From Swiss-Prot, chains A, B:
Topology, Cytoplasmic side: 1-248
Source species: Thermus thermophilus (strain ATCC 27634 / DSM 579 / HB8)
List of residues binding Mg(2+) 5: 219, 222, 246
Binding site for Mg(2+) 3: 91, 132
Gene name of the record: mgtE
Main location per the UniProt record: membrane
CBS domain mapped to chain residues: 134-196, 198-248
Coiled-coil ranges per UniProt: none
Protein name (record): Magnesium transporter MgtE
Residues that coordinate or bind Mg(2+) 2: 87, 243
Subcellular locations according to the entry: Cell inner membrane
Reaction catalysis annotation: Mg(2+)(in) = Mg(2+)(out)
């Protein structure tokens, strides 16, 4: 089935082409690839059995991965996607994002709500910006908990806390409500609600916000640390000045 | 007694000179001064009655004040000084210091131990220094007091504390023993002695240390505040980065 198909091709023959693709291994394909013609790589995946073609795409370079998500038929775009592993579904879309995100949105929709939703929750950590700096090790508390319940929970995790110098407030849902400076906790009565103390006014930034921002932002303000939220307003990280003194 | 003396002078006459100086008011003198000759201002104070001559020097510009403490006889140096008001005694010596401190020490000795000691507990005039920046409003605690006794004393004075961000430790005598970061107090058991928590290793600086130092020091270290001690190792102030961002 090697050069056994290169015939079904040089001929415009719609038969001996479908025959070898049926009994053609993904791998057997992932090989001669780099030698083939633009045109060739475009009919294979199109005629290939919807579970295989996928097996293939999910293993090519990226620049390619999104470019083929742009010429491949709408119907062939649906099928390929549904057969990817969620993870290889993760790196996929992200590879398309980096370039054209405008298409990022019309592609999430062509998806299945069950799938599109799922994907929306993995979908976002690129090698550059907020995500590629933050360290999930910060400290958070609920805004109801008394200064008492808190201080008690602080000795416990003072030892796994990057710094208890800037404590974040969050609600049931996991979204940021403000910041609490250590300077406050000590003076406030142990009976007051974290609400009555925290400044709801804290400066965050999107996981996808550019690393040129958080440096500017963080420098203008003379901050040492700085909270990162996602798209629903939820705390998921902390960017520091040193990881930003590195991004130069 | 005006030009009524300018005769006792142009003559080398040791008599009609002592006669008008006896009934000559300090003021009457502090005037025509700026017109007189170096030489003249030198015999007046020398023959003048030891309580008056003083009354005079303690009111002249500074550059002068120390220069005359350098040509005036050893015996005339003793008498003048003892009649100064301690305060006018304060700015006096300080004016001599700025230039020649080497003489600062042989002058404190020509003093009376009772007086020399008293005077030693005085100054603060520095080159914009240490002293000309610090704000006696910082926060201190004894190293014995339990985290309990402390926290309790913190809500009380949180309201008169420039920052309870860097708490200084001090002993009976009033000398600095180390620094305590807020970060610590919260975690530590309320029963521990401040000793078992504070870093005795805190970077201070002399009240007389150059404002070019505390900027360098404070910049290399990334400190926001910085404790000032005197010569016995006692806390008396806090220099901040903003008062040092000012000294340019």
């Amino acid at each position: 089935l090697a050069v056994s198909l290169q015939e079904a091709l040089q001929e415009g023959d719609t038969r001996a082409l479908r025959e070898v693709l049926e009994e053609i291994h993904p791998q057997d394909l992932l090989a001669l690839w780099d030698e083939l013609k633009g045109e060739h790589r475009y009919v294979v995946l199109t005629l290939l059995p919807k579970a295989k073609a996928a097996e293939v795409l999910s293993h090519l370079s990226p620049e390619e991965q999104a470019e083929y998500l742009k010429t491949l038929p709408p119907w062939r775009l649906r099928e390929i996607l549904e057969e990817l592993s969620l993870d290889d579904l993760a790196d996929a879309l992200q590879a398309v994002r980096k370039e054209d995100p405008a298409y990022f949105q019309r592609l999430k929709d062509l998806l299945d709500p069950r799938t599109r939703a799922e994907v929306e929750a993995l979908a976002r950590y690129e090698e550059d910006e907020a995500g590629g700096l933050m360290t999930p090790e910060y400290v958070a508390v609920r805004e109801g908990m008394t200064v008492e319940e808190v201080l008690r929970f602080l000795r416990r995790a003072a030892p796994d806390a990057e710094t208890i110098y800037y404590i974040y407030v969050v609600d049931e849902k996991g979204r940021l409500k403000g910041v609490l400076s250590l300077r406050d906790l000590i003076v406030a009565d142990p009976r007051t609600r974290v609400a009555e103390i925290m400044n709801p006014k804290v400066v965050y930034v999107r996981t996808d916000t550019d690393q040129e921002e958080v440096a500017r932002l963080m420098a203008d303000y003379d901050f040492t640390v700085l909270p990162v939220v996602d798209e629903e307003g939820r705390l998921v990280g902390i960017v520091t000045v040193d990881d930003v003194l590195d991004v130069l």
